[PDB]
mmCIF file of C-alpha atoms and ligand atoms in Angstrom:
data_model
loop_
_atom_site.group_PDB
_atom_site.id
_atom_site.type_symbol
_atom_site.label_atom_id
_atom_site.label_comp_id
_atom_site.label_asym_id
_atom_site.label_seq_id
_atom_site.Cartn_x
_atom_site.Cartn_y
_atom_site.Cartn_z
ATOM 1 C CA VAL A 1 -0.180 -0.316 -0.068
ATOM 2 C CA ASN A 2 1.335 3.077 -1.330
ATOM 3 C CA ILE A 3 -0.236 6.387 -0.026
ATOM 4 C CA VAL A 4 0.222 9.081 -3.322
ATOM 5 C CA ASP A 5 -0.284 12.564 -4.264
ATOM 6 C CA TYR A 6 -2.202 13.057 -7.392
ATOM 7 C CA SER A 7 -4.008 16.092 -6.344
ATOM 8 C CA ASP A 8 -1.937 17.652 -10.157
ATOM 9 C CA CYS A 9 -4.172 15.611 -12.168
ATOM 10 C CA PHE A 10 -7.592 16.415 -10.253
ATOM 11 C CA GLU A 11 -6.834 20.112 -11.327
ATOM 12 C CA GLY A 12 -8.580 21.788 -7.689
ATOM 13 C CA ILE A 13 -10.891 19.362 -7.485
ATOM 14 C CA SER A 14 -12.018 17.380 -4.707
ATOM 15 C CA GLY A 15 -11.090 13.303 -4.812
ATOM 16 C CA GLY A 16 -9.416 10.247 -4.981
ATOM 17 C CA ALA A 17 -8.230 7.888 -6.528
ATOM 18 C CA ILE A 18 -7.046 4.238 -5.933
ATOM 19 C CA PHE A 19 -5.161 1.748 -8.606
ATOM 20 C CA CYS A 20 -4.641 -2.072 -7.442
ATOM 21 C CA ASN A 21 -2.596 -4.559 -9.265
ATOM 22 C CA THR A 22 -3.281 -7.888 -8.240
ATOM 23 C CA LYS A 23 -0.110 -9.511 -9.638
ATOM 24 C CA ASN A 24 1.919 -7.897 -7.670
ATOM 25 C CA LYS A 25 -0.455 -6.550 -5.052
ATOM 26 C CA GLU A 26 0.662 -2.646 -5.389
ATOM 27 C CA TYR A 27 -1.675 -0.878 -4.430
ATOM 28 C CA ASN A 28 -1.557 2.645 -4.809
ATOM 29 C CA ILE A 29 -3.937 5.664 -3.321
ATOM 30 C CA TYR A 30 -4.478 9.166 -3.089
ATOM 31 C CA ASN A 31 -6.902 10.302 0.052
ATOM 32 C CA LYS A 32 -7.643 7.355 1.668
ATOM 33 C CA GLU A 33 -9.607 8.396 4.133
ATOM 34 C CA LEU A 34 -11.858 8.961 0.780
ATOM 35 C CA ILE A 35 -11.160 5.872 -0.670
ATOM 36 C CA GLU A 36 -13.080 4.264 1.687
ATOM 37 C CA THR A 37 -16.318 5.846 1.734
ATOM 38 C CA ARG A 38 -18.582 4.026 0.639
ATOM 39 C CA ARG A 39 -21.433 6.625 -1.577
ATOM 40 C CA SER A 40 -23.712 5.453 -4.078
ATOM 41 C CA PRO A 41 -22.815 4.042 -6.852
ATOM 42 C CA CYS A 42 -24.875 6.602 -9.400
ATOM 43 C CA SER A 43 -24.253 4.905 -13.293
ATOM 44 C CA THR A 44 -21.556 2.880 -12.310
ATOM 45 C CA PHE A 45 -23.935 0.193 -10.865
ATOM 46 C CA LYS A 46 -24.122 -0.494 -14.618
ATOM 47 C CA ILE A 47 -21.008 -2.761 -14.653
ATOM 48 C CA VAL A 48 -22.634 -5.435 -12.521
ATOM 49 C CA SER A 49 -26.288 -4.636 -13.319
ATOM 50 C CA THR A 50 -25.241 -5.513 -16.846
ATOM 51 C CA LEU A 51 -24.097 -9.077 -15.251
ATOM 52 C CA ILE A 52 -26.856 -9.752 -13.231
ATOM 53 C CA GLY A 53 -29.196 -9.614 -16.282
ATOM 54 C CA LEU A 54 -27.229 -11.939 -18.832
ATOM 55 C CA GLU A 55 -26.380 -14.259 -16.052
ATOM 56 C CA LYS A 56 -30.770 -14.311 -15.667
ATOM 57 C CA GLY A 57 -31.555 -14.187 -19.009
ATOM 58 C CA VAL A 58 -33.142 -10.940 -19.579
ATOM 59 C CA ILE A 59 -30.654 -10.686 -22.012
ATOM 60 C CA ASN A 60 -28.634 -12.250 -23.429
ATOM 61 C CA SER A 61 -25.888 -10.278 -25.840
ATOM 62 C CA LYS A 62 -24.424 -7.196 -26.779
ATOM 63 C CA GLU A 63 -27.271 -6.610 -29.605
ATOM 64 C CA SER A 64 -30.155 -7.331 -26.998
ATOM 65 C CA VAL A 65 -33.311 -5.326 -26.590
ATOM 66 C CA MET A 66 -35.301 -4.134 -23.784
ATOM 67 C CA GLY A 67 -38.413 -3.596 -25.592
ATOM 68 C CA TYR A 68 -38.922 0.391 -26.310
ATOM 69 C CA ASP A 69 -42.424 1.464 -25.895
ATOM 70 C CA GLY A 70 -42.601 5.096 -28.022
ATOM 71 C CA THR A 71 -42.234 7.067 -24.141
ATOM 72 C CA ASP A 72 -40.075 10.495 -25.515
ATOM 73 C CA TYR A 73 -37.350 11.476 -23.690
ATOM 74 C CA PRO A 74 -35.044 14.426 -24.059
ATOM 75 C CA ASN A 75 -31.649 12.167 -25.141
ATOM 76 C CA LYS A 76 -32.158 11.435 -28.311
ATOM 77 C CA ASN A 77 -30.986 8.462 -28.353
ATOM 78 C CA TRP A 78 -33.172 6.819 -25.994
ATOM 79 C CA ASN A 79 -35.854 7.429 -28.028
ATOM 80 C CA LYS A 80 -35.089 4.000 -30.374
ATOM 81 C CA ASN A 81 -35.380 0.505 -29.182
ATOM 82 C CA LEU A 82 -31.698 0.632 -28.337
ATOM 83 C CA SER A 83 -28.686 -2.062 -28.162
ATOM 84 C CA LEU A 84 -27.568 -3.399 -24.703
ATOM 85 C CA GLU A 85 -24.195 -1.407 -26.203
ATOM 86 C CA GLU A 86 -26.200 1.409 -26.816
ATOM 87 C CA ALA A 87 -27.975 1.593 -23.757
ATOM 88 C CA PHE A 88 -24.364 0.875 -21.881
ATOM 89 C CA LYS A 89 -22.614 3.917 -23.573
ATOM 90 C CA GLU A 90 -25.678 6.086 -23.243
ATOM 91 C CA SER A 91 -26.516 5.304 -19.958
ATOM 92 C CA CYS A 92 -30.162 4.634 -20.858
ATOM 93 C CA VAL A 93 -32.219 4.811 -17.801
ATOM 94 C CA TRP A 94 -35.605 3.370 -18.659
ATOM 95 C CA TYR A 95 -33.632 0.285 -20.250
ATOM 96 C CA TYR A 96 -32.070 -0.458 -17.078
ATOM 97 C CA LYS A 97 -34.219 0.589 -14.964
ATOM 98 C CA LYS A 98 -37.073 -2.391 -16.823
ATOM 99 C CA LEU A 99 -34.067 -4.549 -16.628
ATOM 100 C CA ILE A 100 -33.583 -4.989 -13.309
ATOM 101 C CA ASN A 101 -36.916 -4.545 -12.638
ATOM 102 C CA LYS A 102 -37.452 -7.895 -14.326
ATOM 103 C CA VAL A 103 -34.735 -9.258 -11.473
ATOM 104 C CA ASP A 104 -36.554 -10.863 -8.228
ATOM 105 C CA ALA A 105 -35.413 -9.012 -5.073
ATOM 106 C CA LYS A 106 -33.438 -11.921 -3.272
ATOM 107 C CA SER A 107 -31.819 -12.819 -6.795
ATOM 108 C CA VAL A 108 -30.165 -8.899 -6.528
ATOM 109 C CA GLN A 109 -29.529 -9.656 -3.080
ATOM 110 C CA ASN A 110 -27.668 -13.246 -3.091
ATOM 111 C CA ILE A 111 -25.402 -11.253 -5.945
ATOM 112 C CA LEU A 112 -24.900 -8.558 -4.135
ATOM 113 C CA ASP A 113 -23.640 -10.589 -1.358
ATOM 114 C CA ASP A 114 -21.138 -12.932 -2.933
ATOM 115 C CA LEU A 115 -19.762 -9.597 -4.942
ATOM 116 C CA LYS A 116 -19.245 -7.874 -1.592
ATOM 117 C CA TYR A 117 -20.690 -4.852 -2.865
ATOM 118 C CA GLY A 118 -20.506 -1.786 -0.387
ATOM 119 C CA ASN A 119 -23.797 -2.134 1.958
ATOM 120 C CA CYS A 120 -25.730 -4.727 -0.449
ATOM 121 C CA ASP A 121 -28.557 -2.927 0.468
ATOM 122 C CA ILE A 122 -31.480 -2.605 -1.662
ATOM 123 C CA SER A 123 -34.303 -2.300 0.842
ATOM 124 C CA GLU A 124 -35.418 0.935 -1.444
ATOM 125 C CA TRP A 125 -35.747 -1.094 -4.668
ATOM 126 C CA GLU A 126 -37.796 2.199 -5.403
ATOM 127 C CA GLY A 127 -35.338 4.907 -5.914
ATOM 128 C CA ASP A 128 -34.646 8.383 -3.744
ATOM 129 C CA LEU A 129 -38.560 9.237 -4.494
ATOM 130 C CA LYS A 130 -38.552 12.434 -3.114
ATOM 131 C CA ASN A 131 -36.451 14.345 -6.543
ATOM 132 C CA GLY A 132 -39.877 13.675 -8.003
ATOM 133 C CA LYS A 133 -38.509 11.328 -11.063
ATOM 134 C CA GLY A 134 -40.617 8.816 -10.060
ATOM 135 C CA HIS A 135 -39.755 5.772 -12.654
ATOM 136 C CA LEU A 136 -36.247 6.902 -13.794
ATOM 137 C CA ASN A 137 -34.652 6.224 -9.986
ATOM 138 C CA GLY A 138 -33.344 3.094 -8.321
ATOM 139 C CA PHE A 139 -31.918 1.428 -5.312
ATOM 140 C CA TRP A 140 -28.400 2.214 -7.166
ATOM 141 C CA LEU A 141 -29.210 6.185 -7.443
ATOM 142 C CA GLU A 142 -29.070 8.256 -4.317
ATOM 143 C CA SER A 143 -30.145 5.965 -2.484
ATOM 144 C CA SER A 144 -30.240 2.928 0.338
ATOM 145 C CA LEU A 145 -26.816 1.135 -1.849
ATOM 146 C CA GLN A 146 -23.032 2.395 -1.227
ATOM 147 C CA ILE A 147 -19.724 1.259 -1.596
ATOM 148 C CA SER A 148 -16.839 2.696 -1.658
ATOM 149 C CA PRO A 149 -14.245 2.379 -3.951
ATOM 150 C CA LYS A 150 -11.926 0.392 -2.665
ATOM 151 C CA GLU A 151 -14.951 -1.737 -2.606
ATOM 152 C CA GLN A 152 -15.643 -0.442 -6.069
ATOM 153 C CA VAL A 153 -11.850 -1.813 -7.080
ATOM 154 C CA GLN A 154 -12.056 -5.154 -5.226
ATOM 155 C CA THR A 155 -15.642 -6.057 -6.758
ATOM 156 C CA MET A 156 -13.906 -5.534 -10.595
ATOM 157 C CA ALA A 157 -10.961 -7.464 -9.523
ATOM 158 C CA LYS A 158 -12.399 -10.135 -8.606
ATOM 159 C CA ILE A 159 -15.016 -10.076 -12.001
ATOM 160 C CA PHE A 160 -12.469 -9.402 -14.744
ATOM 161 C CA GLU A 161 -10.321 -11.810 -13.146
ATOM 162 C CA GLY A 162 -12.445 -14.961 -13.355
ATOM 163 C CA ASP A 163 -13.714 -15.331 -9.544
ATOM 164 C CA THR A 164 -17.518 -15.289 -9.564
ATOM 165 C CA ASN A 165 -19.765 -16.918 -10.753
ATOM 166 C CA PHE A 166 -20.376 -15.049 -14.276
ATOM 167 C CA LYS A 167 -20.280 -17.068 -17.390
ATOM 168 C CA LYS A 168 -17.071 -15.965 -18.899
ATOM 169 C CA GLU A 169 -18.716 -14.733 -21.901
ATOM 170 C CA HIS A 170 -20.733 -12.431 -20.333
ATOM 171 C CA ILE A 171 -17.832 -11.120 -18.790
ATOM 172 C CA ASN A 172 -16.790 -10.654 -21.959
ATOM 173 C CA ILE A 173 -19.468 -8.206 -23.533
ATOM 174 C CA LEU A 174 -19.145 -6.064 -20.350
ATOM 175 C CA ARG A 175 -15.683 -6.409 -21.010
ATOM 176 C CA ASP A 176 -16.488 -4.926 -24.789
ATOM 177 C CA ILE A 177 -18.792 -2.524 -23.590
ATOM 178 C CA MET A 178 -16.399 -1.440 -21.267
ATOM 179 C CA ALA A 179 -13.380 -0.982 -23.380
ATOM 180 C CA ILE A 180 -12.859 3.350 -23.944
ATOM 181 C CA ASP A 181 -10.556 4.838 -26.350
ATOM 182 C CA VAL A 182 -8.178 7.051 -24.767
ATOM 183 C CA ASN A 183 -5.959 7.855 -27.960
ATOM 184 C CA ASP A 184 -3.104 5.806 -26.963
ATOM 185 C CA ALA A 185 -3.072 2.040 -28.698
ATOM 186 C CA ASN A 186 -0.380 0.766 -25.723
ATOM 187 C CA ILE A 187 -2.635 1.159 -23.296
ATOM 188 C CA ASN A 188 -5.922 -0.796 -22.939
ATOM 189 C CA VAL A 189 -8.663 0.887 -20.582
ATOM 190 C CA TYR A 190 -11.757 0.222 -20.210
ATOM 191 C CA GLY A 191 -14.488 1.535 -17.398
ATOM 192 C CA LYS A 192 -17.990 3.676 -16.532
ATOM 193 C CA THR A 193 -18.659 6.820 -15.382
ATOM 194 C CA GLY A 194 -21.425 7.890 -12.901
ATOM 195 C CA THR A 195 -23.000 11.204 -12.117
ATOM 196 C CA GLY A 196 -25.368 11.937 -8.990
ATOM 197 C CA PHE A 197 -25.608 14.822 -6.164
ATOM 198 C CA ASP A 198 -25.623 14.115 -2.154
ATOM 199 C CA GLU A 199 -28.633 15.991 -1.233
ATOM 200 C CA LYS A 200 -27.632 15.508 2.718
ATOM 201 C CA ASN A 201 -24.041 16.434 2.486
ATOM 202 C CA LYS A 202 -24.270 18.770 -0.778
ATOM 203 C CA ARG A 203 -21.828 17.246 -2.509
ATOM 204 C CA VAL A 204 -21.502 15.536 -5.985
ATOM 205 C CA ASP A 205 -20.663 11.619 -6.082
ATOM 206 C CA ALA A 206 -18.526 11.601 -9.529
ATOM 207 C CA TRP A 207 -17.122 8.046 -10.816
ATOM 208 C CA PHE A 208 -15.166 6.660 -13.038
ATOM 209 C CA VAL A 209 -14.471 2.729 -12.590
ATOM 210 C CA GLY A 210 -12.917 0.295 -14.382
ATOM 211 C CA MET A 211 -9.593 -1.156 -15.364
ATOM 212 C CA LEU A 212 -6.245 -0.809 -17.507
ATOM 213 C CA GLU A 213 -4.462 -3.604 -19.025
ATOM 214 C CA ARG A 214 -0.690 -2.990 -20.280
ATOM 215 C CA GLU A 215 2.537 -5.462 -21.966
ATOM 216 C CA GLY A 216 0.874 -8.648 -18.956
ATOM 217 C CA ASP A 217 -0.033 -6.260 -16.332
ATOM 218 C CA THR A 218 -3.504 -5.000 -15.246
ATOM 219 C CA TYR A 219 -4.337 -1.750 -12.859
ATOM 220 C CA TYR A 220 -7.871 -2.634 -11.631
ATOM 221 C CA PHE A 221 -8.968 1.703 -10.524
ATOM 222 C CA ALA A 222 -11.650 4.128 -8.933
ATOM 223 C CA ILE A 223 -11.523 7.921 -9.157
ATOM 224 C CA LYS A 224 -14.399 9.387 -6.986
ATOM 225 C CA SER A 225 -14.456 13.395 -6.508
ATOM 226 C CA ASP A 226 -17.347 14.298 -3.382
ATOM 227 C CA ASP A 227 -16.394 18.070 -4.353
ATOM 228 C CA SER A 228 -19.523 21.046 -3.618
ATOM 229 C CA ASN A 229 -19.088 22.440 -7.113
ATOM 230 C CA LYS A 230 -22.403 20.741 -8.907
ATOM 231 C CA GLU A 231 -20.287 21.236 -12.165
ATOM 232 C CA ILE A 232 -17.842 18.370 -11.354
ATOM 233 C CA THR A 233 -18.947 14.934 -13.349
ATOM 234 C CA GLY A 234 -18.880 11.684 -13.899
ATOM 235 C CA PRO A 235 -17.858 12.840 -17.492
ATOM 236 C CA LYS A 236 -15.400 15.613 -15.522
ATOM 237 C CA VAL A 237 -13.607 12.829 -13.146
ATOM 238 C CA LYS A 238 -12.995 10.306 -15.809
ATOM 239 C CA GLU A 239 -10.635 13.054 -17.996
ATOM 240 C CA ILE A 240 -9.352 13.126 -14.400
ATOM 241 C CA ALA A 241 -8.276 9.884 -14.644
ATOM 242 C CA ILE A 242 -7.353 9.751 -18.177
ATOM 243 C CA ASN A 243 -4.576 11.821 -17.082
ATOM 244 C CA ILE A 244 -3.525 9.875 -13.722
ATOM 245 C CA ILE A 245 -3.395 6.763 -16.521
ATOM 246 C CA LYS A 246 -1.310 8.455 -19.041
ATOM 247 C CA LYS A 247 0.933 10.506 -16.171
ATOM 248 C CA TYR A 248 1.544 7.570 -13.659
ATOM 249 C CA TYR A 249 0.660 4.516 -15.863
ATOM 250 C CA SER A 250 1.798 4.766 -19.064
HETATM 251 C C1 NXL B 301 -25.691 8.158 -13.996
HETATM 252 O O1 NXL B 301 -25.004 8.470 -13.335
HETATM 253 N N1 NXL B 301 -26.702 8.334 -14.262
HETATM 254 C C2 NXL B 301 -27.174 8.211 -15.430
HETATM 255 C C3 NXL B 301 -26.545 9.181 -17.095
HETATM 256 N N2 NXL B 301 -25.447 8.583 -16.629
HETATM 257 O O2 NXL B 301 -24.661 9.372 -15.937
HETATM 258 S S1 NXL B 301 -22.818 9.417 -16.288
HETATM 259 O O3 NXL B 301 -22.637 10.480 -17.563
HETATM 260 O O4 NXL B 301 -22.011 9.781 -15.403
HETATM 261 O O5 NXL B 301 -22.779 8.178 -16.596
HETATM 262 C C4 NXL B 301 -26.777 10.380 -15.924
HETATM 263 C C5 NXL B 301 -26.955 10.820 -14.469
HETATM 264 C C6 NXL B 301 -26.632 10.118 -13.820
HETATM 265 C C7 NXL B 301 -28.370 9.856 -13.337
HETATM 266 N N3 NXL B 301 -29.115 10.581 -13.195
HETATM 267 O O6 NXL B 301 -28.723 8.717 -13.490
#
């Protein structure tokens, strides 16, 4: 466990980072207090909810559809019968809500328990209804389920090192749809952003969680901001994460 200073890449934004290489067990941690604090995963939960849907047969491939019903949404790309790959990349809320609501709560509870997914608290299945957004809510979106960045990395490692019971075919679907382009062919980066606002503490929950492969070595990582500035989003923290990867992990 090495405590590190990535503050220059955070460019004044409050947050922390954790990178873990499980081959040689090198844990690099910036802002240890934050990295151990549990928070809502927000859209980073799509990593796990995709695998749940595949395991239960609700979806089957990166082409799989969820039966769009014509409801009007402000995001153009949500207004179509999109595939799993597109719903993941466009963070289509209705697709992932419909997917998870086809799965019984005990199945979800047991999978989260097996993954040690934070507090594994799905008690508020419906999510944070007081924000007025109705069915565009769920237990993983600023609601009962909370996970620390360190726990995110531990879960990512267990999934992608093949240490869970999820099918390899399903892991590979997730890998494909998580891959991102960082304009450096010499590293393979995979990840997912998340964005929420913590109304109790007046702070954002801005996430980028994923993994990095660079010549035999793999790092699992979670970058997280808790800034009070509402302008700080998941996509912004992904930029920060990319800067760290290029500076220290290339
Ligand atoms: C996930 O955190 N969400 C879904 C969507 N995309 O977020 S992302 O750009 O950080 O991946 C909008 C924000 C958030 C939500 N409000 O549900």
